Each structure stands twice: as C-alpha cells, then as structure tokens.
Design an enzyme around this catalytic site. Sequence first.
Site, PDB file in Angstrom:
ATOM      1  N   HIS E 137      47.740  29.216 -28.804  1.00  0.00           N
ATOM      2  CA  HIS E 137      46.640  28.680 -28.009  1.00  0.00           C
ATOM      3  C   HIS E 137      45.313  29.284 -28.486  1.00  0.00           C
ATOM      4  CE1 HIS E 137      45.422  26.976 -23.849  1.00  0.00           C
ATOM      5  NE2 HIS E 137      44.386  26.997 -24.663  1.00  0.00           N
ATOM      6  N   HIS E 139      41.417  28.726 -29.862  1.00  0.00           N
ATOM      7  CA  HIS E 139      40.233  27.907 -30.058  1.00  0.00           C
ATOM      8  C   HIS E 139      39.486  28.479 -31.255  1.00  0.00           C
ATOM      9  CE1 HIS E 139      40.307  25.758 -26.099  1.00  0.00           C
ATOM     10  NE2 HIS E 139      41.190  26.731 -25.910  1.00  0.00           N
ATOM     11  N   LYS E 220      46.945  18.369 -29.130  1.00  0.00           N
ATOM     12  CA  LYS E 220      46.594  18.896 -27.801  1.00  0.00           C
ATOM     13  C   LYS E 220      46.116  17.774 -26.910  1.00  0.00           C
ATOM     14  CE  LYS E 220      45.191  21.911 -24.589  1.00  0.00           C
ATOM     15  NZ  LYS E 220      44.164  22.875 -24.964  1.00  0.00           N
ATOM     16  N   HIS E 222      44.266  17.426 -23.463  1.00  0.00           N
ATOM     17  CA  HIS E 222      43.415  18.217 -22.591  1.00  0.00           C
ATOM     18  C   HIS E 222      42.690  17.341 -21.580  1.00  0.00           C
ATOM     19  CE1 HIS E 222      40.481  21.102 -21.251  1.00  0.00           C
ATOM     20  NE2 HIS E 222      41.056  22.025 -22.001  1.00  0.00           N
ATOM     21  N   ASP E 224      39.811  17.539 -20.347  1.00  0.00           N
ATOM     22  CA  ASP E 224      38.411  17.281 -20.646  1.00  0.00           C
ATOM     23  C   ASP E 224      38.228  16.069 -21.571  1.00  0.00           C
ATOM     24  OD1 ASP E 224      38.165  19.743 -19.212  1.00  0.00           O
ATOM     25  OD2 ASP E 224      36.949  20.698 -20.756  1.00  0.00           O
ATOM     26  N   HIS E 249      47.297  20.470 -21.430  1.00  0.00           N
ATOM     27  CA  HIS E 249      46.503  20.961 -20.329  1.00  0.00           C
ATOM     28  C   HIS E 249      46.293  19.733 -19.458  1.00  0.00           C
ATOM     29  CE1 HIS E 249      42.409  22.908 -19.016  1.00  0.00           C
ATOM     30  NE2 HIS E 249      42.647  21.854 -18.256  1.00  0.00           N
ATOM     31  N   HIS E 275      49.037  27.492 -20.478  1.00  0.00           N
ATOM     32  CA  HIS E 275      48.599  28.213 -19.250  1.00  0.00           C
ATOM     33  C   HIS E 275      49.262  27.642 -18.008  1.00  0.00           C
ATOM     34  CE1 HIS E 275      45.884  24.826 -19.366  1.00  0.00           C
ATOM     35  NE2 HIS E 275      45.173  25.367 -20.336  1.00  0.00           N
ATOM     36  N   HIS E 323      34.258  25.144 -19.529  1.00  0.00           N
ATOM     37  CA  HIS E 323      34.403  23.717 -19.312  1.00  0.00           C
ATOM     38  C   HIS E 323      33.105  22.961 -19.125  1.00  0.00           C
ATOM     39  CE1 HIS E 323      38.673  23.914 -19.599  1.00  0.00           C
ATOM     40  NE2 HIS E 323      38.673  24.977 -18.811  1.00  0.00           N
ATOM     41  N   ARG E 339      41.392  26.087  -9.205  1.00  0.00           N
ATOM     42  CA  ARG E 339      42.246  26.652 -10.224  1.00  0.00           C
ATOM     43  C   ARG E 339      42.534  28.148 -10.047  1.00  0.00           C
ATOM     44  NH1 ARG E 339      39.835  23.866 -15.697  1.00  0.00           N
ATOM     45  NH2 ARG E 339      40.539  25.846 -16.604  1.00  0.00           N
ATOM     46  N   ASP E 363      44.437  31.885 -25.594  1.00  0.00           N
ATOM     47  CA  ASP E 363      43.327  31.012 -25.176  1.00  0.00           C
ATOM     48  C   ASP E 363      42.004  31.572 -25.725  1.00  0.00           C
ATOM     49  OD1 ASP E 363      42.232  28.673 -24.078  1.00  0.00           O
ATOM     50  OD2 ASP E 363      43.076  29.044 -22.067  1.00  0.00           O
TER      51      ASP E 363
END
Lengths: 122, 100, 100, 100, 570, 570
Positions: E137, E139, E220, E222, E224, E249, E275, E323, E339, E363
Amino acid sequence: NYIVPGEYRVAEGEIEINAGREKTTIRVSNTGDRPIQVGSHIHFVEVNKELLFDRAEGIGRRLNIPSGTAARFEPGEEMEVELTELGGNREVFGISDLTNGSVDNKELILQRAKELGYKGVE
Amino acid sequence: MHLNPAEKEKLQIFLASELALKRKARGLKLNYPEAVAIITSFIMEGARDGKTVAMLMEEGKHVLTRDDVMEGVPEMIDDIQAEATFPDGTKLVTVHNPIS
Amino acid sequence: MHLNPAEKEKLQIFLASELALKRKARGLKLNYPEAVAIITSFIMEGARDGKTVAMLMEEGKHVLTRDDVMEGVPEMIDDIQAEATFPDGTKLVTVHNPIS
Amino acid sequence: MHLNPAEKEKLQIFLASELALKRKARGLKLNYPEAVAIITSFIMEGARDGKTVAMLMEEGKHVLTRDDVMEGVPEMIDDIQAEATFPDGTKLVTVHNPIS
Amino acid sequence: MKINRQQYAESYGPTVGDQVRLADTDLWIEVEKDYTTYGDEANFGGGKVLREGMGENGTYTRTENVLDLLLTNALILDYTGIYKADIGVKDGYIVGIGKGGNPDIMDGVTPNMIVGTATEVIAAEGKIVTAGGIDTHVHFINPDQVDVALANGITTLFGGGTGPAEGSKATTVTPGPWNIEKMLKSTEGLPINVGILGKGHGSSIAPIMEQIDAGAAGLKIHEDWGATPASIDRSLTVADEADVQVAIHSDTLNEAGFLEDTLRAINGRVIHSFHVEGAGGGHAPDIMAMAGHPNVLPSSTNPTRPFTVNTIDEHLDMLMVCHHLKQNIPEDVAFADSRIRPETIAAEDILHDLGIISMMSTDALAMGRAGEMVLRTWQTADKMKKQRGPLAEEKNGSDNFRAKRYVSKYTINPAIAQGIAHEVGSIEEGKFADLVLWEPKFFGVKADRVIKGGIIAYAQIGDPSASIPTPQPVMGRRMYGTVGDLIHDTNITFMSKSSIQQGVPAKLGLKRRIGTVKNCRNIGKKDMKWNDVTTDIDINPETYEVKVDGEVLTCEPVKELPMAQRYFLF
Amino acid sequence: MKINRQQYAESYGPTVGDQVRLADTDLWIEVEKDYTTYGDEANFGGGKVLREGMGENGTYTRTENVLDLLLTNALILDYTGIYKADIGVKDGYIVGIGKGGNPDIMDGVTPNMIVGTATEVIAAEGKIVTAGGIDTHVHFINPDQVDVALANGITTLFGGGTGPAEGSKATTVTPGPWNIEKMLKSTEGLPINVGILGKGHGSSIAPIMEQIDAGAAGLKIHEDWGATPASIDRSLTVADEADVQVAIHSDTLNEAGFLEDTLRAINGRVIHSFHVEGAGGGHAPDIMAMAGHPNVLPSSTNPTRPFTVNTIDEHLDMLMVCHHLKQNIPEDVAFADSRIRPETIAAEDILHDLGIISMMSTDALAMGRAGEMVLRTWQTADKMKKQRGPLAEEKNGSDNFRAKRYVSKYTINPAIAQGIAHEVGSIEEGKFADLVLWEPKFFGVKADRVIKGGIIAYAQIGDPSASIPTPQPVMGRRMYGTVGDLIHDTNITFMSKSSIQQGVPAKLGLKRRIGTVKNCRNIGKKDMKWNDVTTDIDINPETYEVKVDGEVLTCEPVKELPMAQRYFLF
Ligand code: NI
Ligand code: NI
Ligand code: NI
Ligand code: NI
C-alpha cells in the site's frame, strides 16, 4: 524486570565440540625466534616448519579448540595441545602443498615434509 | 571555509549533542541516540582542545552515568568511536562501556 | 546513533528554531519561516517531553503572538503540522491558526 | 517553512559559527574555517538586522583580531564574501582583509 | 572439550533452545533447530575458519557448488521457522539454507554451500535475519520515501502515483498507459523492488485493461475515483483475465451501496481489502467485516497500529489533507469523522492477534508512515502479549507462534496476495536474496544491513573518512548495490504477464530485473500463512461494537509503546 | 620595461628560482625552469591576452593544433620536475606542456598548444598543479568514500570489496566472477578511476584465473583468506600469465611460515607488499624487511604516517574491528598486539625518507583514511626535514629532492606498480588529464579543483545561489564531469587484457573508458621513481630494532603536525 534490549536468555547445558571424533594429545615446540599462532582448522601437519612435534601425529588432524580460535607459541615455547580428526571427505589441498589429496597417504605426506625441512619427521 | 565531506557530517553530531544537552537540562532521562551524540561531541571537542587520545579514552567513561539515561541505554552502548583532528592529525578514540 | 532519514532532516528544524529564537531575543519581528520553525520545534520538543497530542494542539496556539511577527505572517500560516515520537510512538500534531 | 537550497546550506554556516564561538569562549585560538564561519554568520545576521552593505563591509573588519586566531590565519583570509536577504533583497557583502 | 552456552552464544550467536528478546519489547523468540555441526561453525577473519585449504575450498570453480555469498550463523525469523543456519546466495538468489564451508575437512556441509575463491562473507552471528518487507500500500508521492522504507527493512513497494499530484496523494494509482510508462522509467532509478497499480475504474473493459497491457502489476479501486458497483465489477473481470491482484478502498459514504452491495459486486472473486479497519477508508462503520470472508485478503495500514491514547486525536486532520476535503463543508467533516472509531481500532488489534487480518502495509504519505510497517507490527504483537497473554499455542515460555503469525503479515502474505511470492517474501531456497540483518537490540526499529539481490543496498554505517566504518556519525546510507548500473541487477520491476509478452520492457528500455505477477486469482484467505481464519464478523451499526463468535472484541489503548522513545532522536 | 619579482609572481605565479612554501609545513619548492616567453604570458579575462586575433588564434579549426583546454601559468610538482608551464589538454589527454597562445603574434608557442575558438581556459597562476593521486589500497565499503578521496586530490582507486560485508571490511577483495561483474556495473556510477582486485586464494589455478577473465585488474592475497604458500604461489602463477599485479598482506601469525617462507613461495616474482611496516598486517615482527628486496614494490598505508604521540593508542581497537576479532579471545588480542610496534613505525618514517619504501596508500575504511594519503605524505616529509635535516642531495636551500621523492609515492609509483602508468600517475604528454589544482596555502590538505579526463569533476566552491561562486559556504562539491553520461568519458575502468579481449565491457554494458593493465611482471624496485633503494633490512626479533647498513633506524614521535588544526573544523 529490568529490560536489556535484545538480550539473550540462553538455555542450560554445554556444547560439546567435535563430538564423536578421536582426540590426540601431543607436545609441540616453537624452535624459532618469532611467535607462531595456529588456527583451529589448519591441517596440523602443514604448520610452520620450525614447530617441532611428531609430524605423523598431525596428519588428518587439526586443533580440538573452538572454531575460530588459535593456539599461540611464543619463541622457544613448548606446550601440549589436543588434536581432533578432520571430517568431511578427509582430503586436504593447498596450504603447504604437503597433502593435495587424501590424508590417508601418510608416507607421501611425510616424504614431502622431510624433503622441505618440516621439523619432526621420524 | 573549504569544508570537506567529513566536516559537513560531523557538524550534525555537534548539533545533536546540543539538542540532547537541552533535553538533559530540562530534566529528561536521555535515550540511545542522545547519549551517543553527547559522548561523541565531547570526544571531538576534547581533541580540538588538545587532549590526548589516552585522556579521552578515560574521560569518555565519565560524561554520562546510568541515572542520566533511560533503562537499558547503558547496556545498549558497548562502545563509542570518534575521529577528530588532534594537534598531531586525525586519530581514533574508542571509549569502551562509556556508561556503567 | 543509527540516524534514519527523518532524524537527520528534523535536526535542521531544531537548528532553524535556535536561529529564529536568537533573532527574536535581539528584538526582531520574526518572518514566515522563522515563525514556522519555532512552532514546529516547540511541538517536537513537547512530544519528547511526553505531552499528549491534544495538549500540543492547544499549546501551539500560544507560542507566538502577532506582535512577535511581521505584518501578514499570522495570515500566511493557516496551520503547522509536525510528527514526532511520543511515548506511544509517532503521532501527527496539527496546530490550526497558531498565531491570531 | 518552504526552504530553498540556499536556506538549507546557509543553516550550516550559522551552526559552524555557533561551534566556533563555543571554542572561542573556552579560550581557544581559532583556526581558518572557524574564523571564516564566525565572520560569515556575523554578516548574514547583520543583513537580517537591516544593516546596509556598506556598514557590514566595515564592521566585518572588527569581528576578530589577530590575537583571536592561530598563527598565519590572518594572512590566509584575503576576503570573506556572503550573500543574504537585506530589507531590499539579496546583496553581496565582501569584507577585505577581515583580520589584520 | 565443552563450551558453556553463554560463551557459545556470544561467539556464534544463539543455538537450540536459547531465547532472544526482540528490541525492548516483552517478546522472546527461541531457536527451534540449528543446521551447524558443533566445532565446524563457519566464521571469517584473522586466523579464523574460512581460509584456503581450511573452511574455504581452494579447488572448485564458481560453477562447481561454490557460493557468491555466505551469511554465517544467522538466526532466521520467517513464517517457515525460527532457526539457526548459514544462508548461501548465488546469482542474486538464495540457493542454500544449511551449513556452509569446505567438504574437504568439515562435517555436515550442505553440498551446494561451498565457500570457495568466489565467495564473499557476511557475518550474521548475533544477528536476526528476516526477509525484506513487502509493502503493498504505497503512494508514490516523494522519492525521499524510498530510503525511509529501506531503513525499516522494506524491500518491495507495490502501489501507485506520479508524485505529489492530488490523485496520487489520495490513491495508490498510476493512471493510464502514459503515466504507467513514465513511472516504469522513473523506477529504473529507485533502489527498491516496485510494482505499479493502475486505476481500477471504468464501465468499459478496454480503458482499464490497457493499463495492464502497458505494464501495470495490478489495480486499485478507490472511492475518490468512484468505488461503484460497475468499477468493482469491471476491475475484477480484468484481473481474472490478466492474473493480477485488485486492491479496494470501498465506498465509505455508502453512496451507491452498503458493504453487502460491494460484496455482491465482487461476487466471490479474489480481492485485497486495504485498511480493512476503515479509518483509512471504506463503508462506514462496518467495512472490517470484509476480513471474515474467504475470498478477501485483508490488510491494515499502519497509523491505527496499535491502539494508543493519542491515535484518535491525530486522525481528523490527517484524513482531511489526504482526501482533499474542506473544513468549511459540513458533509466533508462528517465523512471524515465517520471513519474514526475507537471501537473498530481496538478490535483491529485483536483481529491481528487472532489471525483474522492477514497483512500489514504502510499507506505511505497518504494516511500512513513509509518507515513504520515493521515497527508497528511488533508493537502490536507486544501489546497483545501484555493484554491477552501468551497465545495458547506457545511452548517453552517463548513467543514463537506469535512471532511467526506477525512476521508473516509483512513478508510472505503480501507477496502471496500480489502474486509475487515465487520471487520474494520469505527466506527460502530459490527466492531472490532480499535479506535484512538486525541487531536484536534494534530489531524492527533500525535495520543494520539491507541486502537486495545479493548485494548490500543500505546500511547503518559511520564516518566515510574514518580508519574503520564504525566511528560516528552512524546513519542510514545507500551502499554500492544502489550505484551505477548495479541498481538494475539488485532490484525487480514486477509487471503483468501481458505487458511482458508484449515486450514493454524492451520498448521502454527497462534494464531492471523483470518479475512476472502470477497466481493471484486462485487464492483466498486460506492461503494466508498463520493468518487464515474465516468467521462472521458482526459490527453493530449503532455502537460500532465488533463481535466474533458471540464475543465482543475490545481492549484498552496504551500510554506507552516499546520501540519508541528509547531509539528515536525526534 | 622590467617588473620586480614580487609583482611578477603575484600576477603570473612564480618563475625560475622563486620558492613557495607547501601549506604550513617547513617545506619549500623552487621553480627549476619556466617555459614562458616573458611579456607573452597567457592569461584570460576582461582586456587580457587570450582574445581573438591576439593570444587567441581565430583561424584554425579544432583539429589544427588547437587545444580543448589550456591551464595557464601552472607550477607543476611531479616526479619529472618542479617547473612552470602552461598545460594543454585535448580529447581528455595532456597533449602539450609548454607555452600556449597564438603563433600569429607570440614568440615561443608550443606548436600544438594553440588557443583557438575551441579552447576553454583554467587559470593556474598562483596554483600548484599535480597529477591525481593513485590509491592502490582501497576497500570498497561505503560509496561516500569517493568524495572523501577526491577532496584530498585522489583520482584513481584500486582495491576491492562489495560494500560493508565482513570480507570487504577486512580485505581488498571482490571475490569471484559474479561479484566482480556486479562491482564493474556499480563502478559506472563512481566519479573516479577504478580497478578491482580478485581473491588471490586457491590451490587450483582455474578458480583464481576466472576472476581475471571476468574483469579483475589484479589480485589480493590476504591472511584472513589464508596467506599460505599455496595461495601465494597460485596467485603469482596467474599474475605472470595474465600480466596483472598481486598485492600481499602476509601471514602475521607465522602459522604456515615465517617471512623467509613467504619469500621462498614468491620465488623472485614481482609482488606489491601492502602496509609493509606491518601494523596493517604481516609476518610479526619482521615483515618490513620485504622492502629491501629487488622484486618487492613496497607501500605503506596511512595511519602510521608519520609517527606521532597518539599513533599507538588508536591502533588496537581499530585492528580488532577491521579483522573481526573478539576482545574475549586471548589469542585474538595477542595477534592484534603483535602488529603494533613503535620501533618499526619510527623506522618506517626513515625508510620513506631514504627511498626504501616507494609508495603510500590509504587502506580506506579498513585501518586507513580515504582522504589522507596525500595529507600524510607531506606531514611525513616535513617531520623528516625537521628531524634529519635537508637531504644531502638538496641545493639552493630548497626541498625539491625531497618533494620529488615524496610526490612519487602517491602518483607515479603506484601507477607503475599496478601496470597503469601508460595512462595515469604523472603530468606528462600522452597521459590522461587527471590534474589537481592546489592553492599553496591548502597544498596537500584541500584540493581547489580536481580535473578528470579534462573536465572539472570536483571543486571547492561556494553558494550556488550567489552572484558569483566565491561567497560562503565554500565546500567540496561534485561538478559537471560527474553528471549524466559525462561520468563515463571522464573516468577509466582498468581491466585485465584477457577480460578486454573477451568482450567483458560489451557483455556488461560498461560505458566508461576502458584502460588496459599491462607491464606488471617485468618491473622491480629499480623502477620506482626516486625510491629505488634495495638493501638488507634487519629486524631484531627480541627488540624489534630495525637496522640498515649496520645503523639502527629510529626517531622520536612528534606532538604536533602541520596540515592539521589550522585547517580542519573537526
Ligand atoms: Ni485508502
Ligand atoms: Ni492509500
Ligand atoms: Ni592488510
Ligand atoms: Ni587493507
């Protein structure tokens, strides 16, 4: 209760090295004028020419001491050491070029030792 | 100034020692890197002062005591080594078991 | 010392804060990077002292006031964020509008 | 803080000056890089204080005297140059023969 | 002649039955077996055993059972065991685990572990040796994150991003063929193994699949980018065709569905649930129930690991930044707040201890810390021992069962999940020689030496101007494995089978070792080593209380952790 | 019109008969000759001589006797002389030493030293220019060691290692074909010339020889791998076939033989005896007697250079760390102690001064300091002048004879020993343009500019954001010669003839300049410039007293050195 980070808690008992192998005690003299230190895994018959001992008793053997340690002989110093048997294939190559093959060829090893002046060939 | 690579790096030992000394001054028991920094900087400043290697090998054992540091820190530090320019050139100082 | 990349970088926040504190001590109104350095170092030293994240979120608003800094600096700093090793590991502190 | 490459580098001049000032305070005659660091940091702090380039060109000659430094150091330093942010932007200060 | 145990362990490292404390934790590991022959231990140095005609063989050429590298006297901590052995490396791979030396004169030498003219030696006596960490995970936001990861023993980074673009700052995504190609080329300069995830979003197959053909190693999904039933379905259809893994996610907002709708869209296909506790993202409040299902490979990210007194207070602002949310929009804050739950964070500690969550991950830089996956794994294990006691399965007063359960979470299990365990993720013969040496006092905190493809890539080492390498300042530094063209041979770029078949590496001029992703679609929770538990997890929608087998899972947060202020300068 | 000497030297640097102090030492060098024509000196700048139609020729294309680079007004310090000249560089090589400018209008222009459109200018007026240092005892342990070396004027590193592995931390060895290949590829990213030594150990030829064929440039025999009669013999047999040099660190322990046995095994073949005094290793106590023999090329390593009041106290712990020894093993300590002798260290100072030890070297990071070979050479020369007086051979009150004897120890002699003096090691026409500029006040301490293959690679330079390059902080920095692909053209990888013939560079994708090692087996002590003395050296086995020609060689340690606390921040 006090924490020493990464500390050991060793088990009980002792570790026997070279277990099951024949042991031999011999007397060895440094006849030279400079110190000689001999490691645990050198074929004992192939040590410095100026060490005097019964060279035949070093054939196929090494010091019976912990791996990575050594025996030290100051100039003129005589002492007793304990030897153990070599294992594996019981072959030695290189070092002093006395063996280059099986350690069973005692006569050939001693002939070479004598010709080159390794002390104590009887 | 003509700084070489080592001069640049060793500035950050002095800096870390200054940080650690401020933490000690406000009452904190020091951690592993703090303790190492203080003793190391002490050695390099001692060389600059013109002390001998032998003097620093023994003084380095009296810079911090066990009550100055966290539990386990004394046993974590087996030795501290530092090189610095003495009046007779660069030399290595090794302090064995600096904190009893 | 076994310094990791973050430990090396964060030394330079402490250094910048020391510089800025000297400038403040001789009577200068502080600029943007100076003010950020002082508040950031305050947070990381607070963590080292064993304060909580919540304590530092509120203390960080009282380190510098508007009369300590140049015109416009309070409005330039919307928040300051810093991570440090608390007694319970690394945590992020965010101080919102540190200078009113 | 938004540090640029020069801001990062120049922190280490301030640090070296702090080191050198501590050595001077405990009675040592300063060496070449120490002397250069002290005078350089003096110039950059002077700019931050809002002095003029002309003021610093003359003050820089009175920061250290020959009795503050080792034999030969005065003659090794022909000039010291430093750039810093004055109230009117970056400018170069050159101090000729800073130590007589 | 006999040696007492204390002296033996000081000289050669510990042997059978001896225990070693992990850093400043309460966790003890015990040597289960030892491959040595007592008296014929390998060691290197002045007057030592690995010398020509002695423990080094002077006869054989490199190809004749000789090693390129021998790690002597290692204490291996791996899913496969906790035991003492020499480790032999050749052509960048682990070729032997056993006993190294010279069969001329030593008993018990493993036949392909001859120390010869060609052999380098690393002394591992007194060290713990583990596989390199596998972080799934990641980025890709700031290249300075690589050294951070290496310093805590991570050797593979799987994830996505193009640098500090908002898409990458939120999601592990390198979107589309062009961004994927660009990041494969960037990867040529990163001294760590890498695999890249594409965007698992679309309602048509071709826009998603073309990322796999371009060189992505997985996808992935996600929220978003829209974690909708359609994006979930298309991504899994692609993954089943391409043999790559999909990470999810899920829709925290429950906008297009609740958890049960996401599970219906998944339709029993294999998926890696990121997560899984949900602070890092997913169906509020019940996403952690995914970890009970047989087709889910569940991981945690690290900021909730373990549950501490400061854990909650740091999270709101962390999440808003990640985010791209606005404090002045009430629904943004409500989304964020939804969350962050102590009830599920506390239960997450226990789910790890029970083997219900199988993996850890960072992450990195998007609600997670690049250099703390290994660190926080052991802090969690230590907290669980303190609060729950030794596991029932333990013997001899050791914590070996727990240690194997936890080491698996960041080594073998992520490798299995991503289809790369044929190459990395454990200390086994035939796998790539990504190895981490640890001093026990620093275990899990700061790696001593990180070996990548058989060459040291990173090390804690001192003054480069000094007479020896130990004087201060001792810090983490890149070593020769990272320099020049050697960076190509010591690291792997993992890619899809289709991109490899289509010649992407030659097209892009990639010189790194190319690893094939495979066997991702035919696995499940049952394949997670030491962490294979399936169960019904119930999460109360009113109270957020988590139950397993009719028992509420809860524990207290702690005020202090090991592996913390004793070690770190900041 | 006449110019007084003081003003002439300030403007153009010194001329014939002028003297210059080396740093803060007592050593003075005198200009022996000057190639200029007075009044037609080359100089560059606003309104200066090197301008089109004037001192720059505007007619000729680059191929027509025009230079790529002219160093104006250099004071050359070299084994070949101490003299004033312009130095002309073309295609990365020194092509002319003489007088540069424009034959249109200037008298005495060397015909191939035309300043034209194609010519860059470096002002060397007021600088001392030397060849780059040749360090033949390098352990490749930490890549940060390269800049350390460049900052003290070293431009070639010969040695071995794979990073901070125990074998490399003890020995200058890159063992076997695979480790050699990996380190050749790493070398592509190191901004310095490099040659790699293989392991000089084995009882069969093939395991040793395959290292030479893989790309090694030489071999190291080290006691930690077994410095036995067999390993010595096989290595020299290989070297005689392959035309590469062998370096030896002999059997300190006298385990398989005394010094006379090692010499019998060598059997009159050429060998480079490392750290010949023996603190760094070798037959205790008498290894330094090797430096009397005609087939031995003897070097010192630097921590014993020169003998100071702190020298002994630093050594025991340095040695224990390097050789992986244990303080709790009495024989390990006895071995270490056997190597540290004030009697032989004091005699080593004098043997250097007499031309009996021919070379200096570092032993970087394994009982030696990567950035102090040049430094400690001059500190030794200065101490010897103070204690023994000017050498009998000196004239005019200058120290030119001593300066040529000592500069040879770290430039030409190591290059001759390793078979690379056709390329590097001196300022001569036809050699690679590895040049170091020094301000006299910093001579031997901190290099001003280091030129590698005709482009500046390293420099002491200031603030990159400033209006000019001189403002603070002035520090050592890598320059454009190290950036991008230029690193390939400015540096040489030295390799065996066989590896070159077998296409190793193409096989491995090496882009660096490839240098051939040759003419290593047909040399002896007589070929060491200014340091060619053979003699019977007697070392008393009881007292360690060293005698040459019936005279005990001894001197006092000093409490202070030049080139020390005046210069360094730490
Ligand atoms: Ni997420
Ligand atoms: Ni993420
Ligand atoms: Ni040596
Ligand atoms: Ni060496």
